[PDB]
Predict the structure.
Amino acid sequence: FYLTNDVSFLAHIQWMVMFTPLVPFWITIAYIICISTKHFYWFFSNYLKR
Amino acid sequence: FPNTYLEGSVRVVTTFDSEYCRHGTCERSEAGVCVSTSGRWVLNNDYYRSLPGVFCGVDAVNLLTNMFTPLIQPIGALDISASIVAGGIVAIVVTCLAYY
Amino acid sequence: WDLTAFGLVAEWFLAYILFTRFFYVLGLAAIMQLFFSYFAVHFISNSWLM
Amino acid sequence: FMRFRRAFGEYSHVVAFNTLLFLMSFTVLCLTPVYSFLPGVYSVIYLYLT
């Protein structure tokens, strides 16, 4: 969280490529939900709320 | 043939350690309890505890505990039924965090 | 009649005539694509990256 | 086309939810041939959420 988006994207890509084949499924699901939280609100507000 | 606890669409079978067989081919199966969501044949032998809709365990509690075994498996184990498994964790996580 | 195979063979022959240093990687890609069609399922398990 | 675009905004709110509901229903239907107890529970929860 304490990084700029420019390096945050690279960090997320590296983490997805590297740690994926040796981590439990629910941890990956939680990570994906956490990283994708801020877009669900925008989508719901712009195309589902009204 | 082994003893059957229920019959119909949902089938529950308990087996001892013997080569249970019927018209066709024979295989050896370990003692335990098996349950399937379909009326298809079920056994405690290997290659049987891989098919979808088939649950198995050493005992009643062991089967219930092992029902959640794929949940701790690394990603890349289910193809079609992954969506419901993902949702069953997503809902629990989002509720238990965001509210409590 | 059908002559798609003849056209492909002619195109491959003309490519071989125009030989460059980068023909070997294309040949390797083609042979790998042909090879993966026969075995395929024998050594693909887990490792979604694979 | 401009008149249709202007008119479609009123029902876009319903369409946005109906598209996701159709996707959920299609997924449930796709999961049927294995777990042949799902449709009843899905209908019950569908009526509950209605």
About this structure: The CA atoms of residues 21 and 28 of chain C lie 13 Å apart. The two ends of chain C are 41 Å apart (CA to CA). The helical segments of chain C are 4-17, 23-38.
